[PDB]
Amino acid sequence: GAEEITADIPNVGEAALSKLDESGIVYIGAEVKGGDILVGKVTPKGETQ
Amino acid sequence: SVTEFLKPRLVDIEQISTTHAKVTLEPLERGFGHTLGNALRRILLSSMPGCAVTEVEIEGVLHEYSTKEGVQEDILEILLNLKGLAVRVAEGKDEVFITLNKSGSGPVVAGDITHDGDVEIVNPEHVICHLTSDNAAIAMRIKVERGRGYVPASARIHERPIGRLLVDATFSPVDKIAYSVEAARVEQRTDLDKLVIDMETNGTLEPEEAIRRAATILAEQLDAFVDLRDV
Amino acid sequence: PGVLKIVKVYLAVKRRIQPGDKMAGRHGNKGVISKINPVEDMPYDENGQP
């Protein structure tokens, strides 16, 4: 499929989505530390055993 | 006699300026002047309380690495200038908010800050920024905290809305301390000696009170030795 | 080809001096900072300037 940039990131709580907007891109002026999500991207994955 | 010493007393404050003073302790016995001077210099230069700017909120500003229309200085330079603000907070308050609103061409100084009467600005002539247009306007909310030592923005424990700019705070008001130990004329003896402490500060903290806090700290840490036991 | 969207984010990091940083003059005397000593532990002159 096609990779999509969005704020609907699986297995991630609302704490890491605070600095993201509706489009899934971090706000301008947001103080970010290591491990913080700046752009939320989800890629389609095949069947996993 | 020999086993009894002469207790020094505070005899003079000479206020050369609002940021420079001299305090005289007299009488001091042989060797005690140097010991007390070094101890008081080390305590005063490191462990004395004060009030410093900790948070700034400027309207229309999202981060320090930006510019505001009509202001010659960048926001980072404005924060650096605010770091040098000398603020005296009345006792009982560890957190004050002071506002700075200005419109029109001209330098913006510390005397233009509106405070609720519990905050005194010691250096009203301190320059924060320059407004270069008649239509230029600045509106800032500054947070003043009481503290001790140097607490950088990173070291502060971690929500924070975007726009609140954290400023490194140097709470210590004492900048320079120099002590000179000279001869003192007391009664008929020639062994008593006199300590002169020259304090260069930001004007927030009085000389006599600073000396008293330094002595209190020294005695309070000495109490452990005075009551030496296995703990 | 094959690229749909590129998002670039710019981060500004304030790096302060700390032990391990390389500092040097203009005469070839380079060095690494070993300790950030307190002001009260620095040598000072007769006027009290450390």
Residue B176 pairs with which residues in a beta bridge? B200
DSSP state of B7: P
Antiparallel, parallel or unpaired: β A41-42 and B164-166: unpaired
Residue C35 CB burial class (10 angstroms; 0-12, 13-18, ≥19): exposed
* Residue of C5, C8, C13 to mutate, testing the A interface (most A Cβ within 10 Å of its Cβ): C5
Q: Kindly calculate the radius of gyration of chain A based on its CA atoms and give it in whole angstroms.
A: 12
Please indicate if any CB of chain A lies within 8 Å of the CB of B159. Answer: yes
**Contact, B53 vs B141, CB < 8 A?**
no
**Contact, B204 vs B50, CB < 8 A?**
yes
As given in the structure block, the two tokens for residue B123 are 């250096």
CB-defined contacts A:C, below 8 A: 11
CA angle B199, B202, B205 (to 5 degrees): 70
Compare CB distances from A39 to C4, C9, C11 and report the shortest one's residue.
C9
Neighbours of chain A (3+ CB pairs under 8 A): B, C
Q: Residue A5: what residue type?
A: I
Considering only CB atoms, which chain A residues are within 8 Å of B162? 27, 29-30
Strands (E), chain B: 9-17, 20-28, 49-58, 87-89, 95-103, 106-109, 113-114, 119-121, 127-131, 137-148, 150-151, 164-166, 169-170, 174-183, 193-201
Q: Which residues, in sequence order, are CB contacts of B122 under 8 Å at separation 6+?
A: B18, B86, B87, B88, B202, B203, B204
Distance CA A23, CA B162 (A): 18
Considering only CB atoms, which chain A residues are within 8 Å of C5? 5
Q: What φ, ψ does residue B26 adopt, rounded to 5°?
A: -165, 140
Antiparallel, parallel or unpaired: β B119-121 and B137-148: unpaired
Distance CA B28, CA B183 (A): 10
As given in the structure block, the two tokens for residue B35 are 């010991």
Interchain pair A26, C11: CB under 8 A: no
Resolution of this structure in Å:
3.0
User: DSSP characters for B200-220?
Assistant: EE-SSS-HHHHHHHHHHHHHH
Interchain pair B42, C40: CB under 8 A: yes
Distance CA B62, CA A27 (A): 10
As given in the structure block, the two tokens for residue C16 are 């302060």
**Contact, B26 vs B186, CB < 8 A?**
yes
Interchain pair C40, B63: CB under 8 A: no
User: Cα distance from C27 to chain B (closest Cα, Å)?
Assistant: 31
Please indicate if any CB of chain C lies within 8 Å of the CB of B221. Answer: no
